[model samples]
Target chain A: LGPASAAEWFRQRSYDYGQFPPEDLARRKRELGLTVSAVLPSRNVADTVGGIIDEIHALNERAPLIDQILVVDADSEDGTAGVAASHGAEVYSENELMSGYGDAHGKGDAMWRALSVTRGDLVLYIDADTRDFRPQLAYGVLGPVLEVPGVRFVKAAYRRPEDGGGRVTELTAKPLFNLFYPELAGFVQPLAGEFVADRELFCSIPFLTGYAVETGIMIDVLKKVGLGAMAQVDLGERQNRHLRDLSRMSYAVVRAVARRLRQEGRLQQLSFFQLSDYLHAVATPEGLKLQEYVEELVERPPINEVLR
Target chain B: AAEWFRQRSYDYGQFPPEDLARRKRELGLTVSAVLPSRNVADTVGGIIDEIHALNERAPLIDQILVVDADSEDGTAGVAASHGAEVYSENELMSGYGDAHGKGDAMWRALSVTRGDLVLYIDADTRDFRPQLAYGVLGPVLEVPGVRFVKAAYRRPEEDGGGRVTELTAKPLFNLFYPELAGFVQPLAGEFVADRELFCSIPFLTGYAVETGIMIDVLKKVGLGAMAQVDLGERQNRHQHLRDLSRMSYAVVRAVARRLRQEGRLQQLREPGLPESFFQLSDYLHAVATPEGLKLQEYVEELVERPPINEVLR
Candidate 1:
């Protein structure tokens, strides 16, 4: 018998890539005749994107573990595209792939567009803004789907050393997940930027084009394959880059949850009516100020939707 | 209709001293004003005196009760000397463990109170007035289908700010329960509820009590049963950022509990069903410093007190 609940699923499906090792995973990849693609979504991360690309290259140095390394840049002004290209990654600007589908929205746009060009059995999405990139993060996200049977998705769960500063996750994502989507709450870092999914599963669902990409993807995957096909790998610990606007990130997360609730008919149809898309932030003691720092809740249709 | 709730919102000036006398007498309702206090000896006497005077002007308040939380500052004596019935929470609920917080004080006050409608006001209010009591009472007394009335006010920018309300509570409310988005202040301590409404829902036992009660009341009575009144310009002292953070955590916990109780969610995911069922806890945030990572523990676990009606049974 398999897992009957989320905690049981987390216990059975949670893994450490150390158990399989890179060489073992490579052999399993060959035996199954499978290919894996690692996609890096970047924007103005010239300094750290190269190191992340180098780490992915190190995964393939020993054996053909990662077949394709693609860097999907969101029009970085800091020459991030050149740095990733020089580091031996096939680069594609997010706007160039399916340019007819309007301008790119955000991270989910880059992720959804990268699917149009990738040709692997499984795809791994790694955020290029990570300061301390490691090969374990890459292999940990890919190992479960590569080695485990009936597992189509893997998320990276880790201890955030700077968890107090992780205001968005604690205040918005974690509580909302626990409220509406509790099956995904067992994940320590449900908003973690590292995860891998079978191409078949990744290309079948729409993507919310903003900071809520990870949240939307997890809920959609759970609805499709149930919690049984999902797993999380412990990546030990990691650090994140700071100096980002928090209110905007938290707003995007709230919007993502509201969108899913309405789509599933759990919330009222008039719920979105008269809703203030812009958050009312406090200004310099005059009164409340209205600020729109995030793009609207626009979702790119599934890749297969256009393919058919 | 966007204006569906706008019609329910009211200003304190909408109900004058005369209107309160007319409406309350016509409806045949008795109002009890309760101040849940711990260490507010500085302002309790003035608040009690104001409400007592309002009782003479019009039979607006039938009784005034001061529920103390074992105050070391002689808060109970001041309230009693200023014409209000007083009882220490520890003296009333000897069986329910220990008196927890403001919520426990309010819950314990219910056992000794007698009124058709109950109004709760903060004891530390600097500009205490009779309007604060009658303002929240008017909606429940005059408006049909309105069983609860919460007070909202404009506070000085430097006072105990609405950091948690802006950051945590509103966003969560707008997302999960958008019907409550119309409330200007969901966590305001000043509110009036019908006797039946307040005794039917459980209290969160701590800072999250306001949120927990609001959601439960919404579920029990729906949005049509609620109204909010504007009490212009209230002044209270500022609190520490750390305290506000603790309050934020409690609100988050409160919302999650209601969601779980509503059967739309399940956050407890441990091994054994019986042992880990209905269990939730606060996080020990790992803060990275220049030297090392410091573990900051927040002992903010939420515990629920049973409905007063259930205990009465």
Candidate 2:
């Protein structure tokens, strides 16, 4: 079953257990005045952006958890940003937000630029390509971070087909981690792209600008923080892109590994590695670029205005 | 140009019977299909017969070994009658514990088989095709750098034909190695490998042996040396949801272990107590399973270890 059915099933199961207590929605409004910012990092994903933006907006209306929905595009030519903006997302190109960064081209770059624009203590990053994108994918990650005091990060794991092989639960995220890290291996899915973390923790870490960004973030957060600081919630199953070509996949992997190695000091240089040249035909000339140096610029009001 | 032609000869599903015959004529290369059977008596014979038919036509497979895991029924008998070199797991390794899983049986089967390349197939496979073996072996046999190749299949889905692709496999690719996601199916049951590569890696004795082998091979040889072939459709036994859960758990464990070995585990283990609601079921299991449960009256003498520093290396 896809994520919606699984979510309905989970909701029913919780109801059966007498646990689907209506969240004290008004309680947070009265006390904490919490406002969530859902930032979707998009490239040329016009095919899926409209639906995703709609879902995010619908979620904001229903739960009032998301006060703002932003689609940070890495210069998409495929009208991805336009589609997102048309569907009620506060869309901004990375170049427009951070002028001096040359050009934006990676999820990390988009997310970094988004950090400058969003004004939420808790930020939720959701992938644009999710086929069964639902409100819970956003809520699941944000729920813990909002309700629980100590939780710093919430990662979402779901069952999706492996890109190359039609086999589920094999040759993917968990198995690889099981071999490498037995202690943290208890995470059902470590590589899940959807996650929520405090803005302070997120801005502190240097973001890698390529496919390795997710893995690098997971590693950096884990190393800088600890296992106790993170939680992975099961979002049931997600139907996402599965890579069908091996040569192209290998190129992406090598680049990811190079970035990871560079981060860990295992490799001295990003040398002799080639990246995949796979491109989708889009209508625009904008593209996402990875920047080694990301500036975190926040403007503060004058001292007299703040004191008043 | 001749070398490229030789390499192209090993392309999956493209390796013709004539090409196999030609390779045998020139290189004196012998191939074998190792079908590890575990209580698959009902289908073992047909699988063996299919292998025999392929061998008769192409003469690529010199022998077919059907290794049984102490089946209560006539699994060995059926396989042997169907022209397979049937062997009992008990006889292969005298004191070694009973075949733990498919990996253990395959390792035992390897002890008796002599082939330059070995193609492993699951016994319960319904749409058993001879090309499964030939396809996997083709790339490794032809390509100079390729040490292993995995099979990817197209399974029928309900809506349009369900893509039962590996979910864990892709996320691993997306997270750690997005480029490797192109292999179609990284977790296909059928695999062809050089005997040297197979023997060098320590086979973990569990469900993750195939995955472990892939990661091990990749870490040692790199992705350039590996390949995956799309093998049309594989109508294998449908896995129940419970089985899938257990399988997913095992895969997670296997991948985590590998990450730890690579000193990459700390990357994902972000510090800070996860709120109770986000904790996975297994994490709950770890917390709830008590020491008191194991402390029955008859149970005694629990061993404890001193810190590693206390003991000399």
TM-score of chain A of each: 0.92, 0.70
Recovered native contacts, candidate 2: 0.05
DockQ of all candidates, in order?
Answer: 0.11, 0.08
* Model 2 per-residue lDDT tens digits across residues B25-69: 687777767888888889988888777787788777787888888
Interface RMSD of 1: 7.0
On a 0 to 100 scale, what is the lDDT of residue B7 in model 2? 28
The true-versus-predicted C-alpha distance at residue A125 of model 2, in Å, is 2.7
- Pull out the clashing pairs in model 1: none
* Poorly placed runs, candidate 1 (over 4 Å): A162-165, A241-245, A263-265, A268-272, A281-284, A290-295, B1-104, B110-168, B176-185, B188-208, B212-313
Which CAPRI level is candidate 2?
incorrect
